[PDB]
Amino acid sequence: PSIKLQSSDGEIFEVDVEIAKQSVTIKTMLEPVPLPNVNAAILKKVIQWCTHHKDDPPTDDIPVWDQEFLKVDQGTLFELILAANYLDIKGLLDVTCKTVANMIKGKTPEEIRKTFNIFTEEEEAQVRKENQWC
Amino acid sequence: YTHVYNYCVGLELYKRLKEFLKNYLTNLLKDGEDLMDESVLKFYTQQWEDYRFSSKVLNGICAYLNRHWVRGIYEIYSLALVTWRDCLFRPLNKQVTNAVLKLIEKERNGETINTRLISGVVQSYVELGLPTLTVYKESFESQFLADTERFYTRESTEFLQQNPVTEYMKKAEARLLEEQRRVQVYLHESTQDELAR
Amino acid sequence: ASYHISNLLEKMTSSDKDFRFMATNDLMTELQKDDSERKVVKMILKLLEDKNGEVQNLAVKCLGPLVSKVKEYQVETIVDTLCTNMLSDKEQLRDISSIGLKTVIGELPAANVCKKITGRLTSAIAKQEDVSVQLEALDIMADMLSRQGGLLVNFHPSILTCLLPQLTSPRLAVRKRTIIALGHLVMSCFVDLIEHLLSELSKNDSMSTTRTYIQCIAAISRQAGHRIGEYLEKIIPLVVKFCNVDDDELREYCIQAFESFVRRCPKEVYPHVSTIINICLKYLTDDDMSWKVRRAAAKCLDAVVSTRHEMLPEFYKTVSPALISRFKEREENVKADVFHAYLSLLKQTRPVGETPLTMLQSQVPNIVKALHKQMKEKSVKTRQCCFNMLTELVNVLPGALTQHIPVLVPGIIFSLNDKSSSSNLKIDALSCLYVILCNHSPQVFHPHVQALVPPVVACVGDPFYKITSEALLVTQQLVKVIRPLDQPSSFDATPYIKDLFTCTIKRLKAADIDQEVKERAISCMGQIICNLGDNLGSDLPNTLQIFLERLKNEITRLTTVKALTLIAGSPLKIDLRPVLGEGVPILASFLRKNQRALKLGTLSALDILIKNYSDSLTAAMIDAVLDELPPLISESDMHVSQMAISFLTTLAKVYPSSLSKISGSILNELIGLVRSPLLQGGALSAMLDFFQALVVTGTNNLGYMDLLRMLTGPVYSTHKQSYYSIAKCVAALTRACPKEGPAVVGQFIQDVKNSRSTDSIRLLALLSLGEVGHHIDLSGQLELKSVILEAFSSPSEEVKSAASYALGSISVGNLPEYLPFVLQEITSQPKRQYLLLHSLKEIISSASVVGLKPYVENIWALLLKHCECAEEGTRNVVAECLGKLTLIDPETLLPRLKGYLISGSSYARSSVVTAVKFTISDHPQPIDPLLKNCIGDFLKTLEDPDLNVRRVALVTFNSAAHNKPSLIRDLLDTVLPHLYNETKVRKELIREVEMGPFKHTVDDGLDIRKAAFECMYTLLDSCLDRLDIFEFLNHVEDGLKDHYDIKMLTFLMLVRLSTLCPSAVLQRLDRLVEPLRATCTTKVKANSVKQEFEKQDELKRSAMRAVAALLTIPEAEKSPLMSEFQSQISSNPELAA
């Protein structure tokens, strides 16, 4: 059957039961509603990922497609992870968490802090002293 | 649902919810004294159904900011169950049990009436606990088996004193068939063996 | 072991007999507790050809269990070799091969052996020169079909078409073996095979017929007669047209009929075959056969009488009983079988348009003269048959043969006095005489005592014990009948006194006599003494020691006690004082062992002895009896204590000077038993009587005041029954003293005071006041209603019932002074209405008819006012009160109640329906005939006015059906369409609760549906053969997908139908299976809260159990969408078992 949903801006999108089976927060819905948190851009992005990734058994040990799929600016990734946490998804949440973990692998503290856009000179000496064991 | 996660500050919500549930439950129980028999059963069943429906709605509408971060039980359904369990210890339990027993004897006298009235409290006791039946067998099931055994001993004694054993066999078989029907379509299925034995 | 088996093979393989025997014993013992198997198989095959008999027997016995551990590769090889040797020349080898094959198939439960043997036999069974091969092959095939008969997917047609030409073999033996094999095949049997078999048989019927075809048809029908319903309509006409033949061939034709009735019960072809057999019973023309053709007709009559139950008037109104009765003068077999048929019919006459009683009474004289004519025969079997016939005719109804005793007595006298009579003949004659004397009135046995006393007296003394016991029973019955104390009689029995006494006392001695005869003699002596002992005065004071010495014996302890009880409770005085001194301790000494029957008997004996005889009683026996009371009184047993307390109950009234020693232990036991939960009914009345006797006995330390204080002591310092019992006890104690002033005011001030006064104390005092106010007047004292109202106004809910009971009891105590006040309170007090209504209900229940008849009109005038009330409980109470009031004066209270079914509104109609629903009770009532006709209007008026009224009407119908199913049997056909009208799904007030992910439908007609299903269930379990079955099956199979509880109820009903008359359930198997399969592969929406999943095991588990119960039926070849052992349902099977 065909199920429609209401976007925050006021758009209407078509969803299918098979395309939304992997979800749990909208599966209960399928079993139009206002969703201000999500927008049209993420709706098409999530729905296209679900269509191309729907049937599966129950580099970097991740699909090669995801490398070019997630190559977006930091702002969109912030919106994607916020939606994933709200939608309590598993497949998308694990992929983006792994991608973030790989991108924070072996990086200088100055570039990590600047990119993240977020305790120095009083405790840096102490933490350095008891972390040379590694 | 938006206000669920918009609340997060973000931790002092469990105490308020518990207090609200406790005060609402006490207010509901307060209007449960003027009814003892044939009226308290319907009222209690429908209030319990409403409470269970409200608990289900609350669980289905906010089940994220309860125990997700690290860890009465934090679960909304478990919290409702434990509140119902520790509130049922009030003297209304005795009057509810007496009403249920007198209805059972009246049904066994020859007439029949609706069954959902005490079926509701039976499913309530079966579901209560967390099936983890702790208070159920400890108090209400045990006392119910006590009254059942006493009543059947009375029936056997009077039937032997008055009527011959030929009709006693038929009466006993009819009673056993009624108990099988009760344990099949009226009560829980986790008690056939002990009840039989 | 390898070395062990090698040594065994080496030593055994030495051309020796003893060594081979020991080796065979060793390997069988080893079996019981790759190359080796080949070696042992080869050596066993070699031994199979040995000429020795013992060695061959040992090998063939070893072959049986050897299949369990042997490989599965060479089993085909050994089977093929055995089959090849089966076609040898020497007969001994043939027998050895057949024994081996039978043994291996017997120990068989790898499966290729059955296919190979049946495939080879398919060609082997074909026509061959040798006939022994055919007989052996037929025996083997019979063994297969008896044991095997499993899959056989593509082997049944081949064996079938190959065995068809074998049916025409000239040898009768081969034909019989083929018939047996076919019967075994059909019993083991597929969807169409019987169709071709029956078609071939029918085609062959229209030819030169032979006994083979009819015998085969009878055999296959007997083995499996539940699958031939559409072929019969051409089977019976063939039998009828082939019966009119001169040559003797009707034997198998008549044999077919009885097995046809036995197999297929429902068929509308009975009159034709019945007339055919009735005509065929008339043939009357070892060279002579006509004395044997009627055996088949007699078996036919036996079968048709046994199977048919619901058409008794059809059998009785015809000439069938007449023709059966007149057809008696025939051979021994014919006479025996017609007697058996008539006995079976009379046994069937018991209940399970004149009633059968009229035709039975009119045929009684015919049966009597037929039996009297049949008495004049010297054959013992005819005499036993006639005596059994008389016993059955007397047992079926009482007072049947009240006009033929003078003509039937000489036959019994001759059968008892003749020298040529078997033991069984005498036993049955004596039993018939005893039952005739018992059932018939004593007025038709007075002239016959002179003829009945000598033979019974002579038969009392016989070497046999069964005959002696039956004679003693007859003697006791005759003694009771000749002197009935119930109705005065005018007859002198003085000559018979000594005649009976001599035999009775002669058999009372030991004389190495069996226990049963001694007990019967003791019973006869007891009855004789009790009803006749005034004539016996010389032996009365010396023969009583026999009972005293026999009391010690365990073998005869109950019978002697019962005889003593009967003797003591005789209206005519019996002298027992000299024996009482030495007898009471003997009975008291037996109150230690665990024996309920003996305890009750000896308690009854002592009670009746002390009641009838109390002039001389010492203190030792009283002390011994009292000391034996604590071991008798117990909580587990009620009857023994109820009978033991009678001792003190009688003592306190007859011998008041033996009560000072009752304290300490007996008193404590009585107190504990009073508060025991199990003390109701007669026990309570005995308690009240004993306590009243204690009060009125007038003895020190046993007054009313000290007893009241000691009873109230524990209360001041338990279950409700203890309070009720103690309140009844104190009420009985104070009842015997009507002039009791200080206690009443003390109780009043105890209730009025608040300090140091618990709820239990005031509740008990109010209940006691109510109980005492039952008959004694207490309205004279002033300031009584105020304190009663003050005590009643309490917040405790448990005290409300006691207060209502006390108020009702006080009101019924003297109606005229309390009825106006309670009526005014009901009309005035708006708040306290539940208590007033309950009190009024108690008053109406306990009011005497004399004191309530003038008060009927105003009670009716007030009851109708409270018909409309917001509270459901109040309306139910008024309905119950109206129903209880309707029990008295039906001819006035019922005609008015019938009047508001059309004049009153819907609420009034529901009120009167709920009132009349309580009138019907399980016990018979005088209002039953009026209700039997009023229910018609009561249920026809209420068709479908409103949902609430419909629900109340359905509840009324269910209650009436459960209480008295036979009351509403006639009208059931009228209300069946109405009952089934409200069984389908109707959209009436179902509000679609659209909230979101979760849903919860609110169906108000779930209650009506559940009520209707409950009436269906109670109708099925009360009387199922009184309604259409197809409609009920369709309704039960259609109402599944509505609710959970209804789904379980439907599953339970289907399970019940599976285990009760499943003939109507095997037709629509697919229609029943489909909804269960659809709902099983239903997976409940995941993320739902855990209770739903738990319910689902119960739905899935219940469905599994229902499917198993349905498949318990013999028909299991069909497997529609069943072979799916999925992971989710993999473990459900074993959970069900």
Side-chain angles (χ1 to χ4, degrees), chain B residues 49-74:
Chain B
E49 279 288 323
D50 286 350
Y51 178 84
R52 193 201 273 171
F53 205 52
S54 306
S55 71
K56 254 184 201 195
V57 165
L58 191 62
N59 176 36
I61 192 165
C62 51
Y64 191 41
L65 274 199
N66 48 1
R67 64 183 296 279
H68 207 67
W69 63 303
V70 294
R71 168 150 279 185
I73 302 154
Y74 294 81

mmCIF file of all heavy atoms in Angstrom, chain B residues 49-74:
data_model
loop_
_atom_site.group_PDB
_atom_site.id
_atom_site.type_symbol
_atom_site.label_atom_id
_atom_site.label_comp_id
_atom_site.label_asym_id
_atom_site.label_seq_id
_atom_site.Cartn_x
_atom_site.Cartn_y
_atom_site.Cartn_z
ATOM 1 N N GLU B 49 -9.166 -1.020 32.812
ATOM 2 C CA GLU B 49 -8.962 -0.965 31.368
ATOM 3 C C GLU B 49 -8.522 0.427 30.931
ATOM 4 O O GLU B 49 -7.612 0.566 30.105
ATOM 5 C CB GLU B 49 -10.241 -1.379 30.641
ATOM 6 C CG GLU B 49 -10.436 -2.884 30.537
ATOM 7 C CD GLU B 49 -9.479 -3.527 29.553
ATOM 8 O OE1 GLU B 49 -9.187 -2.904 28.512
ATOM 9 O OE2 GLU B 49 -9.021 -4.658 29.820
ATOM 10 N N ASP B 50 -9.150 1.468 31.483
ATOM 11 C CA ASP B 50 -8.747 2.833 31.157
ATOM 12 C C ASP B 50 -7.316 3.108 31.604
ATOM 13 O O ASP B 50 -6.539 3.736 30.875
ATOM 14 C CB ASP B 50 -9.710 3.831 31.799
ATOM 15 C CG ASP B 50 -11.049 3.887 31.089
ATOM 16 O OD1 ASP B 50 -11.165 3.299 29.993
ATOM 17 O OD2 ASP B 50 -11.983 4.517 31.627
ATOM 18 N N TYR B 51 -6.950 2.646 32.803
ATOM 19 C CA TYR B 51 -5.592 2.850 33.300
ATOM 20 C C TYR B 51 -4.570 2.127 32.432
ATOM 21 O O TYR B 51 -3.507 2.677 32.125
ATOM 22 C CB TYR B 51 -5.494 2.379 34.752
ATOM 23 C CG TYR B 51 -4.111 2.505 35.351
ATOM 24 C CD1 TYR B 51 -3.675 3.705 35.894
ATOM 25 C CD2 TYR B 51 -3.243 1.419 35.379
ATOM 26 C CE1 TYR B 51 -2.413 3.825 36.443
ATOM 27 C CE2 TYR B 51 -1.979 1.530 35.926
ATOM 28 C CZ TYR B 51 -1.570 2.735 36.457
ATOM 29 O OH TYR B 51 -0.313 2.851 37.003
ATOM 30 N N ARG B 52 -4.873 0.890 32.031
ATOM 31 C CA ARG B 52 -3.964 0.147 31.165
ATOM 32 C C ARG B 52 -3.829 0.818 29.805
ATOM 33 O O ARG B 52 -2.729 0.885 29.243
ATOM 34 C CB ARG B 52 -4.449 -1.294 31.002
ATOM 35 C CG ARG B 52 -3.418 -2.225 30.384
ATOM 36 C CD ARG B 52 -4.074 -3.460 29.788
ATOM 37 N NE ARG B 52 -4.243 -4.527 30.768
ATOM 38 C CZ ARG B 52 -4.939 -5.635 30.552
ATOM 39 N NH1 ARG B 52 -5.545 -5.857 29.398
ATOM 40 N NH2 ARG B 52 -5.026 -6.544 31.518
ATOM 41 N N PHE B 53 -4.940 1.316 29.257
ATOM 42 C CA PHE B 53 -4.885 2.018 27.979
ATOM 43 C C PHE B 53 -4.047 3.286 28.083
ATOM 44 O O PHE B 53 -3.245 3.588 27.189
ATOM 45 C CB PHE B 53 -6.302 2.341 27.509
ATOM 46 C CG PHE B 53 -6.423 2.507 26.025
ATOM 47 C CD1 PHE B 53 -5.940 1.536 25.167
ATOM 48 C CD2 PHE B 53 -7.036 3.628 25.488
ATOM 49 C CE1 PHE B 53 -6.050 1.682 23.801
ATOM 50 C CE2 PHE B 53 -7.154 3.781 24.121
ATOM 51 C CZ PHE B 53 -6.661 2.806 23.276
ATOM 52 N N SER B 54 -4.214 4.038 29.173
ATOM 53 C CA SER B 54 -3.420 5.246 29.372
ATOM 54 C C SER B 54 -1.942 4.914 29.536
ATOM 55 O O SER B 54 -1.078 5.625 29.012
ATOM 56 C CB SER B 54 -3.937 6.016 30.586
ATOM 57 O OG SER B 54 -5.325 6.274 30.468
ATOM 58 N N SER B 55 -1.632 3.840 30.267
ATOM 59 C CA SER B 55 -0.242 3.429 30.427
ATOM 60 C C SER B 55 0.365 3.011 29.094
ATOM 61 O O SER B 55 1.521 3.335 28.801
ATOM 62 C CB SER B 55 -0.144 2.290 31.442
ATOM 63 O OG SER B 55 -0.681 1.090 30.917
ATOM 64 N N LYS B 56 -0.401 2.288 28.273
ATOM 65 C CA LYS B 56 0.079 1.905 26.949
ATOM 66 C C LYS B 56 0.331 3.131 26.081
ATOM 67 O O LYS B 56 1.345 3.205 25.376
ATOM 68 C CB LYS B 56 -0.928 0.973 26.276
ATOM 69 C CG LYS B 56 -0.496 -0.481 26.219
ATOM 70 C CD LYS B 56 -1.502 -1.318 25.446
ATOM 71 C CE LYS B 56 -1.378 -2.793 25.788
ATOM 72 N NZ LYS B 56 -2.095 -3.652 24.806
ATOM 73 N N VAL B 57 -0.581 4.105 26.122
ATOM 74 C CA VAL B 57 -0.400 5.330 25.348
ATOM 75 C C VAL B 57 0.847 6.073 25.811
ATOM 76 O O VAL B 57 1.648 6.543 24.995
ATOM 77 C CB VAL B 57 -1.657 6.215 25.444
ATOM 78 C CG1 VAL B 57 -1.357 7.628 24.966
ATOM 79 C CG2 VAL B 57 -2.796 5.606 24.640
ATOM 80 N N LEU B 58 1.037 6.177 27.129
ATOM 81 C CA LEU B 58 2.200 6.877 27.664
ATOM 82 C C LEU B 58 3.495 6.169 27.279
ATOM 83 O O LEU B 58 4.490 6.821 26.941
ATOM 84 C CB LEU B 58 2.082 7.003 29.182
ATOM 85 C CG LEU B 58 3.079 7.934 29.877
ATOM 86 C CD1 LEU B 58 2.906 9.361 29.384
ATOM 87 C CD2 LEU B 58 2.912 7.866 31.386
ATOM 88 N N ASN B 59 3.503 4.835 27.330
ATOM 89 C CA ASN B 59 4.688 4.087 26.925
ATOM 90 C C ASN B 59 4.979 4.276 25.442
ATOM 91 O O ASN B 59 6.140 4.431 25.044
ATOM 92 C CB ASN B 59 4.508 2.604 27.253
ATOM 93 C CG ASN B 59 5.667 1.755 26.766
ATOM 94 O OD1 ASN B 59 6.821 2.183 26.795
ATOM 95 N ND2 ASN B 59 5.363 0.544 26.314
ATOM 96 N N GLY B 60 3.938 4.267 24.607
ATOM 97 C CA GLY B 60 4.136 4.413 23.177
ATOM 98 C C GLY B 60 4.432 5.830 22.729
ATOM 99 O O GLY B 60 4.905 6.024 21.605
ATOM 100 N N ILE B 61 4.165 6.822 23.577
ATOM 101 C CA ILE B 61 4.372 8.213 23.192
ATOM 102 C C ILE B 61 5.686 8.775 23.735
ATOM 103 O O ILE B 61 6.220 9.734 23.157
ATOM 104 C CB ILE B 61 3.180 9.085 23.644
ATOM 105 C CG1 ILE B 61 3.232 10.467 22.998
ATOM 106 C CG2 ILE B 61 3.187 9.264 25.151
ATOM 107 C CD1 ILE B 61 1.925 11.214 23.105
ATOM 108 N N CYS B 62 6.232 8.198 24.807
ATOM 109 C CA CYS B 62 7.517 8.642 25.350
ATOM 110 C C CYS B 62 8.229 7.417 25.920
ATOM 111 O O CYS B 62 7.909 6.962 27.022
ATOM 112 C CB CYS B 62 7.332 9.729 26.401
ATOM 113 S SG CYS B 62 6.144 9.365 27.716
ATOM 114 N N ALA B 63 9.189 6.887 25.157
ATOM 115 C CA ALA B 63 9.968 5.734 25.590
ATOM 116 C C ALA B 63 11.444 5.904 25.252
ATOM 117 O O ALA B 63 12.148 4.916 25.011
ATOM 118 C CB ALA B 63 9.435 4.443 24.966
ATOM 119 N N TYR B 64 11.929 7.145 25.230
ATOM 120 C CA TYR B 64 13.316 7.441 24.895
ATOM 121 C C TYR B 64 14.099 7.999 26.072
ATOM 122 O O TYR B 64 15.160 7.470 26.416
ATOM 123 C CB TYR B 64 13.372 8.426 23.718
ATOM 124 C CG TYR B 64 14.750 8.588 23.118
ATOM 125 C CD1 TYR B 64 15.585 7.492 22.943
ATOM 126 C CD2 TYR B 64 15.217 9.836 22.726
ATOM 127 C CE1 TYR B 64 16.846 7.634 22.396
ATOM 128 C CE2 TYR B 64 16.475 9.988 22.177
ATOM 129 C CZ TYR B 64 17.286 8.884 22.014
ATOM 130 O OH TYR B 64 18.540 9.031 21.468
ATOM 131 N N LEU B 65 13.604 9.060 26.705
ATOM 132 C CA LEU B 65 14.303 9.689 27.825
ATOM 133 C C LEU B 65 13.852 9.113 29.165
ATOM 134 O O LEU B 65 13.484 9.842 30.086
ATOM 135 C CB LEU B 65 14.096 11.199 27.780
ATOM 136 C CG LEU B 65 15.061 12.001 26.906
ATOM 137 C CD1 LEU B 65 15.052 13.467 27.306
ATOM 138 C CD2 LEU B 65 16.470 11.428 26.983
ATOM 139 N N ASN B 66 13.881 7.786 29.282
ATOM 140 C CA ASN B 66 13.524 7.111 30.525
ATOM 141 C C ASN B 66 14.711 6.377 31.134
ATOM 142 O O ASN B 66 15.046 6.616 32.298
ATOM 143 C CB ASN B 66 12.353 6.147 30.283
ATOM 144 C CG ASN B 66 12.563 5.265 29.067
ATOM 145 O OD1 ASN B 66 13.594 5.345 28.398
ATOM 146 N ND2 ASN B 66 11.585 4.417 28.776
ATOM 147 N N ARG B 67 15.361 5.484 30.380
ATOM 148 C CA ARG B 67 16.519 4.758 30.886
ATOM 149 C C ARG B 67 17.604 4.602 29.826
ATOM 150 O O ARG B 67 18.478 3.739 29.968
ATOM 151 C CB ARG B 67 16.108 3.378 31.408
ATOM 152 C CG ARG B 67 15.544 2.447 30.348
ATOM 153 C CD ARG B 67 15.090 1.133 30.962
ATOM 154 N NE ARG B 67 16.201 0.391 31.543
ATOM 155 C CZ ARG B 67 17.043 -0.366 30.852
ATOM 156 N NH1 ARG B 67 16.930 -0.506 29.541
ATOM 157 N NH2 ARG B 67 18.024 -0.996 31.492
ATOM 158 N N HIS B 68 17.570 5.418 28.770
ATOM 159 C CA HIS B 68 18.476 5.213 27.644
ATOM 160 C C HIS B 68 19.913 5.577 27.997
ATOM 161 O O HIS B 68 20.854 4.968 27.476
ATOM 162 C CB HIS B 68 18.002 6.026 26.439
ATOM 163 C CG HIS B 68 18.423 5.455 25.122
ATOM 164 N ND1 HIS B 68 17.936 4.259 24.639
ATOM 165 C CD2 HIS B 68 19.283 5.916 24.183
ATOM 166 C CE1 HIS B 68 18.478 4.008 23.461
ATOM 167 N NE2 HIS B 68 19.300 4.998 23.162
ATOM 168 N N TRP B 69 20.107 6.567 28.870
ATOM 169 C CA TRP B 69 21.447 7.118 29.055
ATOM 170 C C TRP B 69 22.370 6.125 29.758
ATOM 171 O O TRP B 69 23.362 5.668 29.177
ATOM 172 C CB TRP B 69 21.370 8.462 29.795
ATOM 173 C CG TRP B 69 20.827 8.428 31.193
ATOM 174 C CD1 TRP B 69 19.608 7.961 31.592
ATOM 175 C CD2 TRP B 69 21.471 8.925 32.371
ATOM 176 N NE1 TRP B 69 19.464 8.114 32.950
ATOM 177 C CE2 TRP B 69 20.594 8.706 33.452
ATOM 178 C CE3 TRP B 69 22.711 9.523 32.620
ATOM 179 C CZ2 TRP B 69 20.915 9.064 34.759
ATOM 180 C CZ3 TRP B 69 23.028 9.878 33.918
ATOM 181 C CH2 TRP B 69 22.134 9.648 34.971
ATOM 182 N N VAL B 70 22.065 5.762 31.005
ATOM 183 C CA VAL B 70 22.792 4.717 31.718
ATOM 184 C C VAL B 70 21.847 3.651 32.265
ATOM 185 O O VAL B 70 22.052 2.453 32.042
ATOM 186 C CB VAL B 70 23.683 5.305 32.841
ATOM 187 C CG1 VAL B 70 24.801 6.143 32.243
ATOM 188 C CG2 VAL B 70 22.875 6.145 33.819
ATOM 189 N N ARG B 71 20.793 4.071 32.960
ATOM 190 C CA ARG B 71 19.814 3.163 33.549
ATOM 191 C C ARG B 71 18.684 3.975 34.171
ATOM 192 O O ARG B 71 17.526 3.565 34.169
ATOM 193 C CB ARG B 71 20.461 2.257 34.603
ATOM 194 C CG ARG B 71 19.472 1.480 35.457
ATOM 195 C CD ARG B 71 20.063 0.159 35.916
ATOM 196 N NE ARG B 71 19.981 -0.858 34.874
ATOM 197 C CZ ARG B 71 20.326 -2.128 35.035
ATOM 198 N NH1 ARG B 71 20.786 -2.577 36.190
ATOM 199 N NH2 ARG B 71 20.207 -2.967 34.010
ATOM 200 N N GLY B 72 11.214 1.719 42.223
ATOM 201 C CA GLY B 72 10.474 1.581 40.982
ATOM 202 C C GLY B 72 11.364 1.384 39.772
ATOM 203 O O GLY B 72 12.508 1.837 39.750
ATOM 204 N N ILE B 73 10.836 0.703 38.761
ATOM 205 C CA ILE B 73 11.570 0.434 37.531
ATOM 206 C C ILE B 73 11.389 1.615 36.586
ATOM 207 O O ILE B 73 10.306 2.206 36.506
ATOM 208 C CB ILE B 73 11.097 -0.884 36.890
ATOM 209 C CG1 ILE B 73 11.274 -2.044 37.871
ATOM 210 C CG2 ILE B 73 11.869 -1.172 35.610
ATOM 211 C CD1 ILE B 73 10.331 -3.200 37.627
ATOM 212 N N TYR B 74 12.461 1.960 35.868
ATOM 213 C CA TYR B 74 12.450 3.158 35.033
ATOM 214 C C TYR B 74 11.448 3.043 33.889
ATOM 215 O O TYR B 74 10.923 4.057 33.413
ATOM 216 C CB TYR B 74 13.853 3.426 34.491
ATOM 217 C CG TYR B 74 14.862 3.789 35.557
ATOM 218 C CD1 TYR B 74 15.478 2.808 36.324
ATOM 219 C CD2 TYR B 74 15.205 5.114 35.791
ATOM 220 C CE1 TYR B 74 16.403 3.136 37.297
ATOM 221 C CE2 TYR B 74 16.129 5.452 36.762
ATOM 222 C CZ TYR B 74 16.724 4.459 37.512
ATOM 223 O OH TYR B 74 17.644 4.790 38.480
#
